[PDB]
Amino acid sequence: GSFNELNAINENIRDDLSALLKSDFFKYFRLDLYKQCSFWDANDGLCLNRACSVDWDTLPEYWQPEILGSFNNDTMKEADDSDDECKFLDQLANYCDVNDFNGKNAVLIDLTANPERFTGYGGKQAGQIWSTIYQDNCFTIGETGESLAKDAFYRLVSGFHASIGTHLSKEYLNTKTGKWEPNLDLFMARIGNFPDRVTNMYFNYAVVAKALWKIQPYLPEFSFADLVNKEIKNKMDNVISQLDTKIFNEDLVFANDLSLTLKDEFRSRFKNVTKIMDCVQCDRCRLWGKIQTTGYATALKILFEINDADEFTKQHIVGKLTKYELIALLQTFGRLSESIESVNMFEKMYGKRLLER
Ligand SMILES: Cc1cc2nc3c(=O)[nH]c(=O)nc-3n(C[C@H](O)[C@H](O)[C@H](O)COP(=O)(O)OP(=O)(O)OC[C@H]3O[C@@H](n4cnc5c(N)ncnc54)[C@H](O)[C@@H]3O)c2cc1C
Ligand SMILES: CCN1C(=O)CCC1=O
């Protein structure tokens, strides 16, 4: 039912969204190569005894997890204090220091050259990080909406977890031919045989779509004279304008039910998630983890704040988002759009699977 509608919406915007995310404005993401993990050392501390790999001795050295999850340094660019990602959307048409972008070794990564895919990352470390995230699902008891908050937090994490599982299944490395291709059996093992994980990805899709729909009317211009950035903002509006659905009438994140205390806690909770991404040993995994956790935190900030705000406050909320956050939000939407498409694609592979049996 709900899948049918969100799926139809996705069919319409899938290619335009993908095109938009490849643009110069959206293709880069600021990442601090410096990692500050509390649970352990992620700066120089390596992961031994395959504590960070999924269940490689018989495969070439260039297909080891450490390589599959490594960055492509050739596309990366230097990130200075003048980097627009640190600026408020209001400023587009110091800054990095003001908005707390205090990275010791920040760089701009080319997301087109560093896609989310199977990297072989996993084992005990990946398991510990996921468990820690699900376990930190705690809110002040007695607060109005405590159970709703715990349910929403869980669903967002689960949909995030599922989107990653879907991507590593869709873009899997065949160790025989050495080509990246869909792996149906893995998809079934990570997503297909667990219906609720698919539901949670649709939930996340609706949450992010709603945040984008809500801010669209208040997005400031990207530039006045620059034709390139001008057309970019136009293409963004064209995508968002097609997201309208009555599903948005639903209070997906219980914005109307959660107390102000729970909202801050909820927001603070996702901040901790973004932070534990620094413990992820796999570079590409950490990058996309940072992108998506930030995207979800941004969707939450938007939905919680725009809910009961007057028009003057709406333009303020949207205008103070940083380019960094907007990139995170749209790239996260792009991963969810791709995840739903992958589910559709796999359903067809499944069909032609049982037919060949
Ligand atoms: C932030 C982060 C980013 C990552 N990015 C990548 C990546 O880009 N590419 C790549 O190959 N690997 C990536 N990984 C690894 C990947 O998520 C898996 O942990 C991995 O493939 C090994 O899988 P597994 O079966 O051991 O456990 P997982 O499949 O992670 O399972 C963890 C446990 O959680 C449960 N679980 C699984 N999915 C869900 C869900 N959606 N909802 C509720 N429970 C679930 C399982 O039953 C199991 O108990 C990342 C890990 C983290 C922590
Ligand atoms: C009782 C311990 N606990 C919390 O405090 C939140 C999640 C959890 O299991």
Side-chain angles (χ1 to χ4, degrees):
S2 303
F3 288 27
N4 300 163
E5 166 144 49
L6 292 175
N7 193 294
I9 288 177
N10 202 51
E11 300 294 347
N12 279 303
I13 63 77
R14 193 274 172 169
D15 289 326
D16 287 334
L17 174 59
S18 177
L20 178 62
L21 296 175
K22 293 172 187 166
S23 68
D24 284 358
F25 186 95
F26 287 106
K27 70 179 293 179
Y28 299 97
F29 193 70
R30 184 187 176 95
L31 185 75
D32 175 41
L33 300 182
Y34 173 64
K35 303 154 62 182
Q36 180 66 302
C37 176
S38 302
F39 301 66
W40 52 64
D41 181 298
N43 184 302
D44 298 300
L46 294 179
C47 201
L48 304 176
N49 301 303
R50 297 187 179 184
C52 294
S53 63
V54 61
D55 294 299
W56 306 83
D57 299 295
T58 70
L59 301 175
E61 70 196 315
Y62 51 76
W63 285 343
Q64 298 300 299
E66 309 89 300
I67 305 305
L68 301 183
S70 67
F71 290 140
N72 178 301
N73 175 55
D74 181 281
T75 51
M76 298 173 90
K77 309 306 175 188
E78 56 179 58
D80 53 9
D81 302 305
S82 59
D83 165 37
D84 287 349
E85 286 192 37
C86 301
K87 297 181 178 59
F88 294 132
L89 295 187
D90 286 333
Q91 304 173 302
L92 300 183
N94 43 13
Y95 299 66
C96 291
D97 188 295
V98 178
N99 288 299
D100 297 300
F101 289 79
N102 308 306
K104 299 188 178 183
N105 301 289
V107 298
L108 297 182
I109 301 179
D110 183 332
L111 303 182
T112 301
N114 291 278
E116 187 180 71
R117 63 179 185 186
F118 171 69
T119 68
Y121 179 64
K124 286 299 182 179
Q125 192 188 86
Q128 288 184 296
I129 295 180
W130 283 126
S131 291
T132 297
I133 291 174
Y134 287 112
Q135 289 295 299
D136 183 49
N137 191 352
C138 322
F139 295 82
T140 298
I141 53 177
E143 286 299 312
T144 305
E146 129 169 55
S147 295
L148 299 174
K150 192 156 183 175
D151 181 285
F153 177 77
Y154 167 76
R155 207 159 303 292
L156 289 170
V157 174
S158 180
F160 164 45
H161 197 171
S163 66
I164 287 167
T166 300
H167 274 74
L168 60 86
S169 289
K170 180 276 185 175
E171 190 91 315
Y172 187 85
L173 174 64
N174 181 307
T175 56
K176 293 185 176 182
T177 165
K179 62 192 174 187
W180 299 86
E181 50 176 45
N183 181 339
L184 176 63
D185 296 318
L186 187 54
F187 173 73
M188 295 307 293
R190 303 301 189 78
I191 306 287
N193 296 316
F194 301 92
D196 295 343
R197 299 180 182 177
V198 172
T199 296
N200 293 337
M201 287 190 286
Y202 276 91
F203 173 76
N204 283 18
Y205 185 90
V207 173
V208 175
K210 187 179 181 180
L212 289 162
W213 175 258
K214 290 295 177 171
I215 70 179
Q216 190 288 302
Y218 313 90
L219 290 168
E221 300 301 311
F222 289 177
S223 179
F224 295 126
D226 189 303
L227 297 181
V228 179
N229 294 302
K230 184 179 293 67
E231 66 175 62
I232 291 301
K233 192 279 185 176
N234 294 309
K235 294 181 179 181
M236 186 183 152
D237 289 307
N238 294 325
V239 169
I240 301 180
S241 299
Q242 308 180 62
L243 304 183
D244 187 59
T245 168
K246 301 304 179 181
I247 292 178
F248 293 160
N249 294 317
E250 299 175 55
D251 187 22
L252 307 173
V253 293
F254 310 102
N256 295 304
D257 303 308
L258 301 187
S259 66
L260 185 58
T261 301
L262 281 183
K263 285 176 179 176
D264 301 319
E265 270 172 43
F266 200 153
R267 300 266 298 287
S268 180
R269 212 63 56 183
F270 251 80
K271 180 176 182 178
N272 294 320
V273 176
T274 301
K275 178 53 190 175
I276 197 172
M277 293 299 111
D278 289 346
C279 296
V280 176
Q281 215 72 55
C282 154
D283 288 351
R284 286 196 186 199
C285 309
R286 168 166 178 272
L287 166 64
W288 283 98
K290 278 288 190 182
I291 288 178
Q292 296 171 89
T293 54
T294 298
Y296 290 119
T298 298
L300 288 174
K301 172 159 69 178
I302 290 171
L303 298 176
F304 287 165
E305 283 174 35
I306 197 168
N307 185 50
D308 298 292
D310 48 39
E311 294 301 297
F312 190 65
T313 297
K314 293 183 183 180
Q315 64 77 39
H316 163 63
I317 287 168
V318 178
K320 64 177 172 71
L321 284 174
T322 59
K323 173 175 174 178
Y324 175 79
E325 294 173 289
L326 183 59
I327 292 169
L329 185 61
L330 272 173
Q331 287 290 346
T332 296
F333 189 49
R335 288 310 96 211
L336 290 162
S337 173
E338 188 107 310
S339 291
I340 290 180
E341 180 62 28
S342 293
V343 170
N344 296 330
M345 181 279 292
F346 276 125
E347 223 162 66
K348 285 148 59 171
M349 289 187 82
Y350 182 69
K352 58 193 303 174
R353 237 296 183 66
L354 282 61
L355 292 179
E356 300 298 300
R357 292 178 176 177

